[PDB]
Each structure stands twice: as C-alpha cells, then as structure tokens.
RNA sequence: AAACUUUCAACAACGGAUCUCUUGGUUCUGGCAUCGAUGAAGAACGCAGCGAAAUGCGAUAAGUAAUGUGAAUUGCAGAAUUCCGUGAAUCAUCGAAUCUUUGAACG
RNA sequence: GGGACCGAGGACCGCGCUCUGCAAGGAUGCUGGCGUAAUGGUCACCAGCGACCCGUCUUGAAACACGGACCAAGGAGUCAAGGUUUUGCGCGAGUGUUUGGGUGUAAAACCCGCACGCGUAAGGUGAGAGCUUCGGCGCAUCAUCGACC
RNA sequence: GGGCGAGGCUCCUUCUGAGUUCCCUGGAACGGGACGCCACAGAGGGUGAGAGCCCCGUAUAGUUGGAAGCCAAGCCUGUGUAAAGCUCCUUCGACGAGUCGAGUAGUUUGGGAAUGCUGCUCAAAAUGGGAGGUAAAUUUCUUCUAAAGCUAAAUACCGGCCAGAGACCGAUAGCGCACAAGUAGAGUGAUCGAAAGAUGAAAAGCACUUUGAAAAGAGGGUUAAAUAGCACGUGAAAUUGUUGAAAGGGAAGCGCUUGUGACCAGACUUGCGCCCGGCGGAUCAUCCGGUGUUCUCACCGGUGCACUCCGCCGGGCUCAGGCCAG
C-alpha cells in the first residue's frame, strides 16, 4: 500500500508516515460528478411565484 | 491503477483552466506546453514527460517533468537555465527531448520555442514612419 | 460573517435605514476620527461630532483645510467647516458640506458629557486589551 | 383526477426543514424543564393485533395495574416517577404480563429518585 | 456506431483499446467484443452465475468465460465450480461467490492481455427475452 | 486521514466502487509484448502516397 | 439651372426605446398573540410664523407630562445653550394626560 | 500549324520511355513597369439583360375574399399529477436515505432504526455468433419432439 | 401546610480590532504600484469612482442600567385528637327518557345490517342496552356502556406585531398603486378606475452687461461636463428642418455585369545565409571539482588570457520577398 508524508507547522516533514487510505483510488467519473451536482445544486433554491 | 495520462486527457480534453477558445482556434496557456496548442501531444500537465520553456533575464528556462515525483509538486520539476549561445541551448534542449527517450517528438517543437525566446530578446528595429494617401495625404 | 439571527445582510434594507435614520441615530452615522495626539491622550477612536470640534479636512477638493465646525446639518450628513465656503453667482458666500468621515478631529469640545462619552470608550478599550494581553 | 377545484387545495411542504428545527428545539425546551428527567414516558411492550402482525411486538400506550402490582409500584405512585400508566388494558396471557413486569424491574434497576422536598 | 452513446471515460478507453485490437487483427472475437461495448444496456442483459455453470458443465471447463455484460449472482445455485470470468462489471455476492470457489475475476482490459486473440473463451450472452 | 478509512467502512449499503477496467494507461497495454505479438503487419502509413 | 419628389450622410428637432440604477413589489421561512360602550373600525371639521396635499395631533391641537441621549432645527425669518447643564432636538423611548362632531352610537 | 480556358498537389517512393536523361503519380524558367489607391473593396448613379406584393384561407388548381399607414417595446405548446417508449447512470434478486429521527459551518451537506411501495423466492434434434488441441465445443434466438405445474 | 426570599433564566440597553503612510491618473481615490496592520470580525451600508483597517455596523466573550414573568439556595413559622395513600372484609355498592327503538318523508355518504342528520306517527328495558363475530345446531361467543360536562401538545393560517431570506420582477415588468393611488377622473347608484421614478459629488439652479412690452435671446459666468439649464442621466426608430452629393419623358423598389465619382482596408518599407576588413568583449574546444537529472546528458566554479567563440560597424555576393503583365 502507498504512503504519505506528513508536514509540521514549519513545513517540513516530521518523520510521521501514513498509509493511503483506499478511497484515492477510486475510479474518477466526470459524468456521475456532473449528474450528481446539478441535482445537488438545485436542492438549496427557494420558491418564485406570481 | 484507475489515473493515467489518458485518463485525465479525456476528464480535460473539452474543458480547461489553461483553455482559451475562439472562432479561429484553441490555444492553452499550459507552462508545459510547447506550442500553445491543444492537444494530447503537447497538452504538459497531461503526460507523464513534457518539456516547457519559458524565457530568463538572458536566455531560456527549460522545464521538465519528473516522472518519480508525479505526487510531489515542489519536486517535480527539472528546471535548466541557458544562459550561453544559442547553439549551446539548441544542443542540450535537443538532446534533453531526444538522447534518452524523453518526449523526442518534441524534439523540433522545443528547439523552435527556445529559438523564438531567444530572437524576442533581440532589440528591436525602429518603425517607418506611416504614409497617408489619397484623400488623407491631400488634408 | 453575519451570525446572529437579528442582523440583516440585505443592500435594500440597510440603504432604507440609513437614509431614513432618526436624528438621534444619525448624529452616530455623522462620527469623525479622532486625531493622532487626542487618540494616544484619551485612547478613543472615533467619536460623534458637534458644533464645537475643531477639525482637519483630510479628504475632498479641501487638501489640508483647518477650521472650526459650525453646523451639523444632520437633514444631509454634512458638516459645516469655518471658512471653507465657496461663493454664488452673486458672490454670496455659502458653506461646502464636508462629510465627517473625510475630516479629523484637532481639537474636542468638552463638557461634562463628553468626558462620559471618552470615559466610557475607554473603559471598553482597556477592558479587551487586558483581556486580550492576559 | 381534477375534476375538482384542486389549485385551491394544495400544499406545498417547503417548510419541512423548518418544522425540523422547530420539533428538534421544542425537544430541548422540554429537557430543559426536566432537566435530569428524561422527555419521554417509558411505556410497556405489546403484541399488534391482526394475524398479518403478531410476529412482532411493539411499544403500547400504558402499564397495566395487574403488571404494575406485580412490579411493585404504586398507581399513584408511577405517573409521577415517569411511567405510563393504561387502564383499558387487559393482561389475558402470563406472556404478556410477565414481558412488562420485567420492563418495570429494569426500569427500578437505572432509576435514581431523589427525596421529595 | 463510431461513438458510444455512454458518458464513461474508462468504457471510452475499453472501446479504443478493441477498436485498436480489431483493426489489427484477425480474430472475430475482437469485433463482437468492439461492437456490443457500443450497444446499449437493454441490448447488453445480464449473465448470472446459472447461466454460465451451465455452459461449462460439458467440456468448456479450464476456459474463459466472457461477457460484454454485467454478471449477476444466483440463489438458485448452490455450488459455484472454479471458473475464469471476464465482464464488464460483476456484482458484489457475484464476485465473492466466484473467489470464494477459488476463480478469478478479470476486466476487459486485462481480457486484451491475456488473450488478444480470445483464445480458449467461451463466449456468452444474456436472455434478451 | 486515519478516519477516511473507518468513514467508507461504516456507509451501509456502499463498498467502493470496482472500475470497468484494471490499467488505464493505454500506451503500456497497446505497446506490451503481449499484444505487439500477435498483431499482423501494417497495412500502410499515417500518410499515403496518392497514385493518380 | 432652380423649385418639387426620392436616397444617403452630418448637425438639429419630435419621441422616449436601449444601458445603468432602485427607501418598490412578489414568493418562502421563523418568533409571537394584541380591536371595541374605559366608546372600536370608518366618516368629518379644526390645529403650524410663513402649508394646498400627504403626515402628525385634537381648542393642552405638526402637540403636553415622564425617561434616555447629549447640542440642535433648517427653505426663510425669529428665539436658543452660557457648554462644565434637570438640558437643544420635525431626536428616540414611553408606564402619565388632553382627546371637537358622528360612527355598534346611547336624552 | 493557329487559338482559348485551366496549373489542383507539395521532400523521396510508382508505372514507364527515346536513358550523362525525360513531355513518366498535377508549372516551371526568363524578363519588364509599378511599389501606390496602381490592383482590390464599399457606397450612389447611369447603362445592357432579368424580375408580379406579402401573408392567410379554399380548391385538383387558379381567381375571389380576408389582414397590411409607419416605428418602438410587449406578444403565444408552459407547469403539475398519472401512464408510456427510447438514451445515459447506480445498485442489482433486489431496489428506494430525505414521513421521520440524529449531526450541522443551519432551508445546504452528512448519517439511518422500524415499517412500507414495486419486483423475486431443468432434456433430444437442425440451424446459429464465437472458440478449436482441427477430432470437435457451441452464446442469444428460431423450428420440432419433449418434461413439469 | 403557609409567608418572605439572596440569586438565576428570558428580553431591551452602555462599551470593546486594524493605514486615511509614499507615488501616478483623476473635479473627487474607494482605482493602479509599494510598504504595513487587524481578523471568533473579508455580512451589509455610507463616504465625491471597486474601502476589512475613513464612519455606522459585523464576531466572541464579557461588562453598565432597566422591565415583567417563572424558577429557586436558604430563613421564619406551623397543630388542628387536622387531612391523605394503601391493606383486609360474617356489611353495602345508587351509573343520564319524548332518549333508544319501529314506520315514514327529505337530504347525504363508498356504505338500506338505513352511512349520518332532520321532521312527523307510535313510543321502551333492567342478570339491561349497543356493536360485532359465527352453517356449525342456537341464535351459545367477543367487545363496549349512549342520551350530562372540562382538558394542553403534535395540526391550519392569503389576516395582526415583527424578523430573516431568494438561481424571482426591474418602471408597458413587479400588486391597480416604487411618486400627495384606491388618488385624479366616470357613474343616480351598486361600482369602475388610471397616467406618472433618474440634473449634478455639491445648487455651485447662471451674478453682471446688452436687445426685447414680455416670454426669451446673446455675451459673461458655475461645473469635470450646460454635448447635464429643472421641457434636466444615457437619448434608438417612425416623422421633420438645414446643409452636402446625386437621380427624375405615365411608378418606385429588387438580381447579374462593367463604367464613372466619392471614400477606404490590406500589402510593401526588407530578412536569411556566405566571403573579406575594423573592432568591442571571454559563457571557444578540452580537462578538473561540485550539483541536478532522463544515468548520460546538462548547469555552476576553475583552467582555457585569442587562426577559437559572442555582438556591433563598413563593403561584396546568393537566396527569399508585394501588385500587374509579356
């Protein structure tokens, strides 16, 4: 399994190691991003009338 | 693994930050790209090896990728200033594109960005003066 | 960022209030900064004007004009500065309303009220630095 | 299905999260009126009635005074320390009786009664 | 069809890699595998794990099992014998039924190593009706 | 970073998606050995010549 | 050739489109429960130094008492405020008053 | 032998011939004037030839009939519920969090305990895509003989 | 069991961060550049143009005074053979009438066992009455108690007192009404019912002179602007005036192609490369050390102090260069 550094408050690395945790590889599908947003989006409009 | 170059070619292939759009054509601003073009040949950030030149004080900053530090931007980067004759810099551009299989299809693209850097340096000639006709130079 | 419930974040509201305001409310509206030497003096910021202030024009066509205020003319947000008039068409001499928030304040009127006034801003300022520094 | 005059009867939740907060915050007023008090009532165990449900038990309006007995707490006594108290209720089973006696014994197991006054 | 009627990046990649893999070939396994990744998901009906049992049981055993599909699981069945099964997309139970025989599982991708050609694959396809 | 792990895993009815396909990179599955052997010879060039 | 008719251009007219703006509307949500014979809602007439309307008030009449703030109002004119003060203000708050003719309207 | 119109392509590759080369898979070579309104373009006009006023409606078609003084702004297949077909996406014998409850940076986003809606609880022969160790194995589907309820 | 009750919660109310530092444009910086600061506050608004730090406010914890409700640590007392819960039993145990119900008429419901209601005729019962289950052998069994009454909460809300928002509309839109709009006005009356926003940062709303009876005009002036003068931001078209150009024997307008006249956009101005000469400068080749990488390619420093390398200038030559042609 892959691993990532970790950084101090000054930026440097701190010796501190930690395993990717499995959800970075993910497939990365635009087209379920897209879909799902736009329904995500309209869920915070408030109603307009006449 | 689930990203490669191709991958993200196709998720940036239609829309882009570096996407510039019009009638007569699609440039890209990429700093990784050599002719300002786009596509999968020369879009930088795309592929795994990629040059970019960009011009210094005097001379030319060349760039490259890192293909063992993909993950680490800070150290990313294999950056050469050429600073000397333009023969010097044409040579070891070339054989940075060429020598070792690294992108030698960019091989005359990147010679010729690192050519226009150079001759844009160059000092520039006064224009001649505009001359009017017809009914303008008559008033 | 607004937090509490209370508060409004709407332009059409606050531009209603703030040309609508009471007098009372405009007079706090109508503040002038403080001057260098008065703010290390009563350690006050800002405080309303008045008729009595002594004032430096620090904003406007008036570069670094000095002078005495003379009407707080609260109807338009505009104070009057002595001797920054321009003249009419028949030479008549009128004021130029000068905003308070473009002026600052040389010399404070003081009375009673305003001593209240400086004491109580500088209780409130000491009290936070205080808590702030420990 | 219009042929009436629907337009003039319809509702339009929009206030449903609204409401939400409004339930969740009348929850914490009553908390915080009794405050070491819990905000509901504990109430008994029972069968649904109908053959198609009575696999599966549920929660019932009130005590039964036989169940209350046998518990060992007064009538007067339960709807004040928080206990629901049904007297329509019939026991009909030792089943029945016997689920919420032993309710009524944990319940007198975690419970914490302070002096009156 | 040129260009599949699916928005997924990576069936985009599968449709290039065959579309490659047909043009520089011989093999008709190619070309079917090409033109059902283009057909739609009515046309592409689901595969269970009865169904494939049951079209090894003769001979067609220590082969590989393709579907341009997605593989379902079964009930029915009770014992799932050890297979080689390649498919677009395989369920949850499905995939955990036929490791825990002691199979293996593969994409399309992984189908174009192994086999360019589909060699010893059986192929198969869902009940339209 | 140590929560993201537990997160995933206790979404109910969820487990992480398995993609359609095993490598994305096309320039090693085309290039490999593997397939380079069994293709036939080219039948031409990215550009042809044109004869008449 | 001019005049007249027509076309275009510049400038100028007629008219108020376009852009920009908005103390307005419209819709949704939240807290709360408060009209009247102790005379309501509505109608009328009066009241300002200079006011027709809108607005405010009722012969104590663009208002009185009390509380707070703390130096104005302003279109003009006239008074202020001593500012080291029960105290300006077409100020805000508001627990005390005044409150013409009617109107459920009641000699 | 005398004219006219045209010059598409852009390293090599080919067919060839009369081979130090060529008229053979598409124009080169030499020269002159000018280098600016000169070519070119936009307007207005004259000239030669050409050319019914739009829309609607009826009809096989015309014709009649109706609308049209001019300009600016506005101006007409939308929303909701219930069915249904096709495309994309998720999970898939299951699927649907969002009545409600629990967090929240507070109408968002995140999470889900119990019900509930819709659906679900094995042959012979001939063709036949595709594999083949060349002996054969045979998806889906159709035809026929079946088997079961 | 009664009476005080510190104090507390809720709501108003006082106070609480940081640039008006330098330069440029500008009538005015709130714009551009530079150098800083605050931030539990970079929501919003104003200030002469896009302001976190000029001003009001914004955030969190406190802090000043007040209002009315409710709670409440504690402190005084209590009282009368006073009240209350249960347990047991050789004693008792009252429960709603012109109301149910039957008949009938109208109406109503998915509901003639009348689904409910109402009117009329008759008019009850006490191991009673109502409803339901059931072929199960008789109408067994189950479940309630009508004709008296009270009660918060979850639910509705185009109205009342406020408050917060919007992928809404932007003056023919949005409510009829952004304005002295249910107004002006019409009708005997019930009722009907409009049009109508924008000078400028600031009126600084044009002193004064002159012509005119005046309305106004012209100078002069304010302003950044009067190409902003209250017939006031910007100011299209229809329609009209003047000036400039042109055409016109009973229509004009439209298509193709030249010509005339007016008016114009391009293109070009030279680049590249060789051979000499005058230079001005050591990033010439090589080698050494360090570093970075694609592990063989580079870069820095040194050596290399001149038939090598880089830029300029003065000549010669080649090639490529615009338009129309032979």
Not at chain 5, 20 to 28: K, M, S
């Given at each position: 399994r892959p691993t990532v550094t970790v950084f101090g408050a000054d930026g440097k690395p701190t010796g501190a190691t930690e395993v990717l945790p499995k959800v970075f590889s993910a497939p990365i599908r635009p087209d379920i991003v897209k879909h799902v947003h736009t329904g995500m989006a309209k869920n915070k409009r408030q109603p307009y009338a006449v | 693994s689930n990203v490669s170059a191709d991958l993200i070619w196709e998720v940036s292939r239609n829309y882009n930050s570096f996407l510039v759009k019009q009638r007569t054509g699609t440039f890209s601003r990429d700093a990784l790209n050599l002719t300002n073009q786009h596509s999968r040949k020369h879009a930088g950030f795309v592929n795994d090896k990629a040059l970019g030149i960009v011009p210094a004080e005097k001379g030319v900053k060349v760039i490259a990728k890192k293909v063992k530090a993909a993950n680490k931007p800070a150290s990313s980067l294999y950056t050469v200033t050429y600073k000397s004759t333009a023969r010097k810099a044409y040579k070891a551009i070339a054989s940075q594109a060429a020598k070792h299989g690294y992108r030698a299809d960019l091989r005359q693209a990147a010679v010729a960005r690192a050519s226009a850097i150079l001759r844009s340096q160059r000092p520039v000639k006064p224009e001649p003066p505009k001359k009017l006709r017809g009914a303008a130079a008559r008033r | 960022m607004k937090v509490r419930p209370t508060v409004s974040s709407s332009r059409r509201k606050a531009r209603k209030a703030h040309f609508s305001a009471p007098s009372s409310v405009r007079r706090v509206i109508m503040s002038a900064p403080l001057s260098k030497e008065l703010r290390e003096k009563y350690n006050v910021r800002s405080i309303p004007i008045r008729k009595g202030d002594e004032v430096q024009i620090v904003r406007g066509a008036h570069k670094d004009k000095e002078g005495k205020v003379t009407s707080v003319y609260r109807l338009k947000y505009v104070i009057h500065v002595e001797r920054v008039t321009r003249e009419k068409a028949t030479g008549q001499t009128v004021p130029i309303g000068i905003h308070p928030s473009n002026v600052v304040i040389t010399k404070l009127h003081l009375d009673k009220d305003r001593e209240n006034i400086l004491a109580r801003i500088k209780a409130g300022r000491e009290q936070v630095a205080k808590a702030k520094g420990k | 299905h219009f042929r009436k005059h629907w337009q003039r009867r319809v509702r339009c939740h929009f206030d449903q999260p609204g409401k939400k907060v409004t339930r969740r915050l009348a929850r914490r007023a009553k908390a915080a009126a009794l405050a070491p008090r819990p905000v509901d009532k504990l109430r008994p165990i029972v069968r649904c009635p109908t053959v198609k449900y009575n696999r599966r038990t549920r929660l019932g309006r009130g005590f039964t005074l036989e169940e209350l007995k046998a518990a060992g707490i007064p009538r007067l006594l339960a709807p004040t320390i928080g206990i629901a108290v049904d007297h329509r209720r019939k026991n009909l089973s030792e089943e029945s009786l016997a689920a919420n006696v032993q309710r009524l014994k944990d319940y007198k197991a975690r419970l914490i009664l302070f002096p009156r006054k | 069809?040129?260009?599949?009627?699916?928005?997924?990046?990576?069936?985009?990649?599968?449709?290039?890699?065959?579309?490659?893999?047909?043009?520089?070939?011989?093999?008709?396994?190619?070309?079917?595998?090409?033109?059902?990744?283009?057909?739609?998901?009515?046309?592409?009906?689901?595969?269970?794990?009865?169904?494939?049992?049951?079209?090894?049981?003769?001979?067609?055993?220590?082969?590989?099992?393709?579907?341009?599909?997605?593989?379902?699981?079964?009930?029915?069945?009770?014992?799932?014998?050890?297979?080689?099964?390649?498919?677009?997309?395989?369920?949850?139970?499905?995939?955990?039924?036929?490791?825990?025989?002691?199979?293996?599982?593969?994409?399309?991708?992984?189908?174009?190593?192994?086999?360019?050609?589909?060699?010893?694959?059986?192929?198969?396809?869902?009940?339209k009706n | 970073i140590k929560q993201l792990d537990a997160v995933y895993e206790s979404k109910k009815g969820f487990f992480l998606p398995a993609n359609i396909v095993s490598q994305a990179d096309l320039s090693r599955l085309i290039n490999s050995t593997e397939i380079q052997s069994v293709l036939r010879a080219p039948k031409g060039e990215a550009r042809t010549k044109r004869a008449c």
């Open positions: - | - | - | - | 069809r040129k260009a599949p009627k699916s928005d997924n990046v990576y069936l985009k990649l599968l449709v290039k890699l065959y579309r490659f893999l047909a043009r520089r070939t011989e093999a008709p396994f190619n070309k079917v595998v090409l033109r059902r990744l283009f057909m739609s998901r009515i046309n592409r009906p689901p595969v269970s794990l009865s169904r494939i049992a049951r079209n090894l049981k003769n001979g067609n055993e220590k082969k590989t099992v393709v579907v341009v599909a997605t593989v379902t699981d079964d009930n029915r069945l009770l014992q799932v014998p050890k297979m080689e099964v390649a498919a677009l997309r395989f369920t949850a139970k499905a995939r955990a039924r036929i490791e825990a025989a002691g199979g293996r599982t593969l994409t399309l991708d992984q189908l174009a190593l192994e086999k360019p050609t589909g060699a010893n694959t059986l192929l198969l396809r869902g009940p | -």
